[PDB]
Amino acid sequence: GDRICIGYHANNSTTQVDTIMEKNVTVTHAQDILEKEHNGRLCSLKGVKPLILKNCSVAGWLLGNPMCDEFLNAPEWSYIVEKDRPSNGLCYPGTFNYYEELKHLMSSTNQFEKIQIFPRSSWSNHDASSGVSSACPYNGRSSFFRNVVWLIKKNNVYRTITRTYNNTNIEDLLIIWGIHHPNNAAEQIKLYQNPSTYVSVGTSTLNQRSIPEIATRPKVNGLSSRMEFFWTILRPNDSITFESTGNFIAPEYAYKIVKKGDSAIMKSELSYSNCDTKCQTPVGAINSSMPFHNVHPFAIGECPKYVKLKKLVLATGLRNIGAIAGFIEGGWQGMVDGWYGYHHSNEQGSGYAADKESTQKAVDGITNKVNSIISKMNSQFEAVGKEFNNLERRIENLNKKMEDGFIDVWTYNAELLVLMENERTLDLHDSNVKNLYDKVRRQLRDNAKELGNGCFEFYHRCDNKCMESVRNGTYDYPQYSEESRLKREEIDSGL
Amino acid sequence: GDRICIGYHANNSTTQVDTIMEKNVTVTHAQDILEKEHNGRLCSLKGVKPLILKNCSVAGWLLGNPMCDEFLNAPEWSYIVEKDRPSNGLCYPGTFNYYEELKHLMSSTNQFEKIQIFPRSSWSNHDASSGVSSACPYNGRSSFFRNVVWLIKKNNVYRTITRTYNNTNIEDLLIIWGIHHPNNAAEQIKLYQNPSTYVSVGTSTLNQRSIPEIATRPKVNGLSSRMEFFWTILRPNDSITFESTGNFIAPEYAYKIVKKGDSAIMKSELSYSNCDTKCQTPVGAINSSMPFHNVHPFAIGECPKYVKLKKLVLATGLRNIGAIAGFIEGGWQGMVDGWYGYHHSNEQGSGYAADKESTQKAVDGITNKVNSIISKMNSQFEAVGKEFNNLERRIENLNKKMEDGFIDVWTYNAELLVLMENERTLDLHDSNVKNLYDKVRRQLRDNAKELGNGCFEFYHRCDNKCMESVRNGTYDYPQYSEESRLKREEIDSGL
Amino acid sequence: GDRICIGYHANNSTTQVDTIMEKNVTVTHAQDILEKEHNGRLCSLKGVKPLILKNCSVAGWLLGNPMCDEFLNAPEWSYIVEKDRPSNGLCYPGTFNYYEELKHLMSSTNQFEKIQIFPRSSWSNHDASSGVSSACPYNGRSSFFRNVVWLIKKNNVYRTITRTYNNTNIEDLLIIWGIHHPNNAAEQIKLYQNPSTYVSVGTSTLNQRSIPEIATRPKVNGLSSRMEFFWTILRPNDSITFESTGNFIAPEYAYKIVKKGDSAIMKSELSYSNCDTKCQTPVGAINSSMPFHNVHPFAIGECPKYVKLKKLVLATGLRNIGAIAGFIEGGWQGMVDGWYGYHHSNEQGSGYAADKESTQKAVDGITNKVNSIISKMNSQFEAVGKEFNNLERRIENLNKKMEDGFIDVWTYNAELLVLMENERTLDLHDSNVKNLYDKVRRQLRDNAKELGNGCFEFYHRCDNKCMESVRNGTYDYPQYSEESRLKREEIDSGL
16 A cells, blocks of 8 residues: 556547547547538628529629619628529520629629719600610510610611710719610611711710620520620719710619628528528538538638638647556546546545646646647638629639639648647647656655556555645655654565 | 466567657558559550640641641540640740640540541632641641631632521530731731721620731741630530631631530640550559558649648557567567457466457547548549749639648548547547456456566466466456465565 | 766856746757738838839839829839828729739839830821810819820711731830720710720730620719720730721830849838838738748748748757756756756866867757757748739638638647757757766766766775776776775674
C-alpha cells in the first residue's frame, strides 16, 4: 500500500476526429462545425419577404407582360426568386439590350416605386389603343406590356414625336422603352406610314438614334416581327427626351429606385412558405448556427461559410482509452469533474481527485482556440450570383473559375486548420498529463519510488492532508524526509 | 559488461529536405514529389489525337481558306493545336465577329461533322463562280474559302435573296456567313448592281440587318476591300433565313457539333509525333506520375498540379547521423530491418534488434500522411486557356491576374504543407526514439543504471530470453528484483 | 552549498505576441512586421515623377481640353494621378469610345511624344478656324481641343476629305479622331452643307464608317449637340486613311508611345510635394522597410504586401517570467549575453554563465526562420487599378471580388503563419531549456541529486574548472566518481 497515480479523463463518448496523421480517432469531447441540413422551403430573410416572380422573368415583371402581376404596393424585398426557365418573358418576341446588366442592378436594389411619366392618354396625335398582339393574351384577348405603349399611326398620319420627362425626384429612375422591327416593308407602312423612321433618346449621358431592322424571321410565339428594348437610369435633375417618326414603344411608367442595399436574384423552382430564416439557399434555408455548411454555394443572408466537404469535426478533449493504474495505460472513466487528475490510495483514502488548476487552464485555451478558429475565416469568400448571355461565355467561365477557385482554397484552408490544431489539441492533452506527472515527481523526490506506470509509492507515511500538499504544489520534502530516510535503507536491507 | 542501448536507423542516403527552421537536412528516406521533365513532343491524349492546324488559324480551318486542309473524316480530337501567329487566316482580309468567343466554344467541343445546307449550285439567279480573288490562291490560281460562296450579280441582275434552312438535326449547328465591304461606289455596283444593299439574318434568337461599309483602306494581302464574318449556333428544330440584295457571302456547309466535352486550344509551335500521354503541355508531354510539376501552367489531361517551385521533397524517415553507443550520439547503420530498435550486448549476445511494433507503427502513419497530403490538393486550381482581342485588354489582365493569383496561392500552399509536416515528420522520429527509451526504462527500473548515453547497464543477470522481455514490454521487475537488490549494495560498498 | 542551476533569459521587454492558443504573451524579443504609417504626400517613384493631371481627366489631357496644360517636354512618368471627379473632361460634351480601355493602356506606358501628323493649316478646302465653341473657353474666348480640328464647310462647300498618314516610325502611334452629332437638320446643313455625311477610317486592322446621330438632348455645358471620339493604335509601317463628307473632327497630333513598362493611374486628391519614395498609395507614401502594410490596397512601387490587419508581430525570443532558482520558476534577468545558460554557486563561484552552443544555435534558426517567412510571400497578390463604365457593372464586381478575394486569402495566410510559428518559436525555447537540463543530467549522474527546481546539488567537490566540464559536455563521471561514492552513503547514514 501507500500509492498515488496520475491519469486522465475517459467517458462514454464515441465522437471521432481526424488529423494529418490519423483517421477516425475517438475522443472524450468534440464540436461538429459543418451544417449539412436544410428545410427545403423559401422563407423571409429576418422579417423581410422575397419578391417571388412565379413563372415570370425579370423582363416580364419590369415591362408588364400581361401574364405577370404588378406589385402595386411598392414592397421592399430581401431577394428576388426567378425560376430557371420562366415561361412569361418577352411575350412579344425580341431582345432586351444589356439585359444581364439590368439583372445585376436588381441585386443591389431593394425597393421600386412605379411612377407614371407619360400617361397612356397623352399622345393625342397617335393611336394609343391599337397596339396589342395575339402574342400577349390577357384573359384570352389580345393585349400587350402594361408599362409601355405601342404607338401607332392615327388616321394614316404619324406626327413626329418629341417628348421630354424631367426627373424632378430625389431617386434614380429606371426607364424602359423599345423599338419595333416589322416583317416587311408593307408592314412598316401599314403601322407607321412614314417608310423610314427612327427612335432617338437623349440624356446628359446617353445619345442614341435607333433604326428599324426589317428581316424575314421564324415565328416566335406566333410572329415574325420583333421588338427590341433598351433601358437607362435617369439621375435626379436630369431629363430625357425621346424623338421618333415611327416604331416607337413609349414608356408610360418608370421605376423609382427607392432602396438600394444587399439583395440577390436567386434561381429556384420552389415557392414561398410561411417561414423565416437568417440564411437562404436556392434549395432551402439554413439553421445558421454552425460556422460552415455545404448545402449550396449560392446562399444569402447572415450565413455560415461554404466548404465542399462531407464532415468537419473539431477535437476539444482527450482521446478515449479498461485503462488501469496510471496514465501510461489509458484514462479513468472514474474521474468526472476534470480532465487530468490523481488517485489517492491511502491509509484511509480511495482516489480520484482532479487537478483543476491545469484542467480549466486546458478548457481555457481550447475554447479560446475554438472560436479563434471560427473568427479567422470571418473574411472568407462568399459567392455572388451573376448571369451572362450566349456571347459572353469567356467571362462567364472566368467568373465560374474564380468562384470555384476561391471555394476550393477556402475549403482547403478550413480542412487543414481543423486537421492541424486537432493534432495539437491532442498533442496538448498528452503534454498536460505528462506535466502533471512531473510536478508531483519534482516534489516527492527521495520519499517515493517511480513505479513506471505513472504512479508513485511512498517510502513514508502520506496522510490525506499531505496529499493535497502534492496536488497544491506545496509538499515539502523535509517534513517527512527523515521518515523516508530510514525506510528505504530498510528495503535495501529487507528480504 | 551487461548493457542495452536504444537507437535509430542510419543509411547511405544523401537525400535532403527542408523545413521552416532548417535548410538542407540529410535524411534516411524521402520522396520527391515535383515533376520537372518533359519529352518536348506533342502526343495523343490517351489514344485520342489532337487536331493540328499547322500554319492555319481556327478561322482559316472553319471557313476553308484554300491553303488549309479540310478534315473530311469528321475526326474527334482531344485538343486543338494552333501556332502562335498562323500564316493562313482570313486570306481575304477583314474581321471575324466574336472570333474569340468562337475559339472558346471550340474548347468545349470534340467533334464536328461538316454538313451541306446550301449547295453551291442552288443559286440559279446569281453567279456562283466569279467570286474568287488573288488573295486566296489554290495551286497559284485565284480561289476563295471553300465553305462559303461569294455570290455575285448574274447578267447585271441581283435578284433579292431569301433562303431558309431548317435545322432538322439532333445537334447544334454552327453556321458562318459574311458580308463584303468594297473599296468604292464603282466597285459595289460592278459586283452587285443595286447601289444600296443589306444582309439580313433571322433565327428565333438572332435578328441582324447588316450593311456594307465602304471606305478607303490600305492593301492587306493585296486588297483594300474587306470581308466581315459572323456566326451563330442554330438549335435543333430551329430555322435560319438569310435575305440580301447584295454583298452576301453565303454559307454552303455548316458544322454539326456532334461531341461536346473536355477540350482545349493549345498554342504551340511543335508538330505531331507518334506518341501518347496522360498530360500534354505546349512545350511537351508529362510523365504524370508525381503529384506536382513545374513544366508549364497550361497543361491538359490527367495532370499533376502546377506549382512555381524548383524543388519539392517530402521527408519520410530519420535524419542521418560515426554514431556510437545509444541514441544521444546518432543512429546505427547496423540496424537494417527497422527504423528504431535496440542493441543486446549480452553474456552471449551482440546486438542490433529492431522494435517493429513502433517501426511499422511509424511507416503506417507517414505513408498514410504522405498520400493524405497528395489528396488534399485534389481540388487545386487548374488553369484554362482563353484569348482576348485588342479591345479587351482589361479582362485579359483580369483573367491573367486571376490565374497567376491562384497559382501563387497553391504554390504557397504546397510549399508550406511540405515544409511543415516535414518538421513534424522528423519531430515524430525524435519523439519515437525518445519513447522507445522510456518504455524500457519504465520496466527495467531499479535493476539497471541509466548511462546517460541512451543505454542501460544491468545490476542483474540479463539472459537473451529476458531481453525480449524488455522488447515485448513484458519484463517483470520481481523475477530478478532480488538479484539486483544485492548487487547494487555491493557497488555502494565496492571499491 | 555546492549547486548548479539551469535557466533562461528575462529582460525589461513588454513586447507582446499572439498564437493560436493564447492572446497577449509577453516576450523578451520580437519583430513587428506590419507597416501602418504614411506621410500623406505624393512623391516621385525612385527619382521618377508622376504625371499630375490636376483638375483634368485623361481625356482632357489627351485631346487637349483648352483648360489642361500640354506636357511639351515629353516627360516620362512613374504613375498618373487623376482626381476622383475631374472638372476638365470633354468640355464639348459627348462620349469617348472604349475610354476605359485607353485608360488601361496608359497603365503599361511611361512616355509619350506628341507628333504632328496633319498640320492645322493643311486643309486648304475647308474652314479650319471656325470650329470653336462656348463650351471650351481659353482665357474666356471660345476655343476647342488643341489636338483635334473641328473641320467646317468653307464657302458653303465641303469637298469630300480623303487623307492618309503612313506611320513611318519605330513606335506605336496613338491617334484620336471624332465625329459631330448636331441638334437638328438645320444645324447639320449650316455646318457641313451636304445633308448626309459619314466619317470613314481604315487601317489594316480597323474598318469603320461612322454616321451622325441627330437627336434632341439636354444642354450639357450649355449645348445639345454631342461629339463622339474614337481612338486606335497605328503600328509601325502601317497607314491610316480618313475619308469624310462632313462632321469630321480631324487629328492634328498623334502620340508616340515611346516607353512602355510598369505604370498606374492612381485616383488621388492630393498634389505633388518635393519628396521621393519606393512606394506610393493614393493617400500617401510608405516607408517600404517592413514586409506588410495595411495603409491602402492600391499601392505601387517596390512595396510591402498588403494585409487587412491591425497588428502583426513575430515572436523571436523567450516569454518573460521574480523568477528564482532554476528554470521551472521562470527566467533570470541576471543572464545577459545569451538566452539559455547556467548558474555556478560554488566554493568560489557565484553564477550566471550562458550556454552559447545552443544560444546562437537558437538565434541561428529563428533569424533563419524569420526571413524565410518574409520570402515565402514574395509572390503574394498585388492589386492593380482598373475602371469600368456604367454598362460593365458585372465585370467591375467580378474584378472587385477577385481583388478582395485574394487580399482576404493572403491576409489569412499571413496571420496564420505568424500565429503558428510563434507557437513553435516559443515551443522551441521551452524545448531548448529542457534539453540544456538533460545534457547536464546525462553527465552528472550519480554524483548529484536532482532538486526538482531545475538545479542539481553535487555529492562531490565541484571545482570551477570542472563546471566548465559540464558546460562543455566534457564532465567525466569517473574522475570524481569515487568521492561521491562515499558521501552519499554518508547521507543515507547521516542524521
